[PDB]
Design a protein around this ligand. Structure first.
Ligand SMILES: O=C(CCCCCCC(=O)Nc1ccccc1)NO
Ligand SMILES: [K+]
Ligand SMILES: [K+]
Ligand SMILES: [K+]
Ligand SMILES: [K+]
Ligand SMILES: [Zn+2]
Length: 308
């Protein structure tokens, strides 16, 4: 009944202009909120433990990403226009953060294999492709972690379930020609990115889709994809940019429905005895801390699911 949480203090240590769209403080604030829950509550103290990652090895990245793309980012030589498409100014701290977060999704996988359920307090970089970055993504932690997971003995088949409001295009292109990683994306069709190469299965929702349509579809599609593919491991992107107050997403999902989504996902994995490694994914609010209660729903779901 232990739930590993994966966190590194470098996650919010990036220097960004104010006004920058990326809610860089949410990671440390979410971590601090959980630290406070643990002081307040015997249940949170007893049910969760933290695991700090070290940077991912470069050999774990280059099976998915082009080496010259990797090298250009390592050396801060990525052409200016390509770096802007990523959406961050280059710095060594950005590279160190990224590699640590990739390491973290990989650790979440090992931890999920051991305990059943593990949550990464970062991650979900589904817009990175083999040879370019976009949409705040440099390297694709989900695909990287799925490829790594397949190196392990118990795992032959990985299902990535992406509930972030944006299409997992990078993940789609990275896994399109491999039958050992299956990609499922739910998303708002009119949100970024414009071009949506096929996942294994895609569910695109109209603007202002609300709780019942989203949840009924999520429940049935996920249950089907789990039955169809019988994965050894699920990677679950629990992005909260589906939320009705998100500043980028165009869906109308409530915090209550986010909770029900996470409860359902985690409860299915448990019922089926499939290890599930979770990434908190995206979320956009100029009030970065406003994302904290939305992401915390994943933890409340895991807490309830584990039996407290
Ligand atoms: O959370 C997300 C990130 C979505 C990426 C942001 C969408 C819009 C965007 O990146 N536009 C853009 C980028 C560079 C320059 C101008 C616009 N996906 O999971
Ligand atoms: K294997
Ligand atoms: K998605
Ligand atoms: K595939
Ligand atoms: K919205
Ligand atoms: Zn998103």
């Amino acid at each position: 009944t232990m739930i590993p949480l994966i966190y590194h203090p470098i996650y919010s240590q990036l220097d960004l202009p104010v006004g920058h769209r990326y809610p860089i403080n949410k990671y440390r604030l979410l971590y601090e909120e959980i630290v406070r829950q643990r002081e307040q509550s015997e249940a949170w103290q007893a049910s969760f433990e933290f695991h700090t990652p070290i940077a991912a090895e470069l050999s774990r990245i280059t099976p998915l990403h082009d080496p010259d793309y990797v090298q250009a980012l390592l050396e801060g030589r990525l052409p200016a226009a390509k770096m802007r498409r990523i959406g961050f100014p280059w710095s060594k701290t950005l590279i160190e953060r990224t590699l640590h977060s990739v390491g973290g999704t990989c650790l979440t996988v090992e931890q999920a294999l051991q305990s059943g359920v593990a949550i990464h307090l970062s991650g979900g970089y589904h817009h990175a492709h083999a040879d370019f970055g976009s949409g705040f993504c440099l390297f694709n932690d989900l695909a990287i972690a799925a490829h790594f997971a397949l190196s392990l003995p118990s795992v032959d088949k990985v299902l990535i379930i992406d509930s972030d409001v944006h299409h997992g295009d990078g993940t789609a292109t990275l896994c399109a020609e491999r039958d050992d990683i299956i990609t499922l994306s739910f998303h708002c069709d009119k949100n970024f990115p414009a071009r949506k190469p096929a996942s294994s299965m895609d569910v695109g929702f109209a603007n202002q889709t609300g709780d019942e349509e989203f949840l009924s579809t999520f429940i049935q599609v996920v249950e089907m994809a789990v039955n169809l593919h019988r994965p050894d491991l699920i990677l679950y992107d629990a992005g909260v940019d589906i939320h009705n107050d998100d500043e980028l997403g165009y869906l109308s999902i409530s915090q209550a429905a986010i909770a029900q989504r996470d409860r359902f996902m985690l409860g299915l994995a448990k019922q089926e005895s499939i290890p599930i490694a979770c990434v908190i994914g995206g979320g956009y609010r100029e009030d970065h801390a406003a994302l904290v209660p939305l992401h915390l729903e994943l933890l409340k779901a895991a807490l309830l699911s584990a039996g407290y």
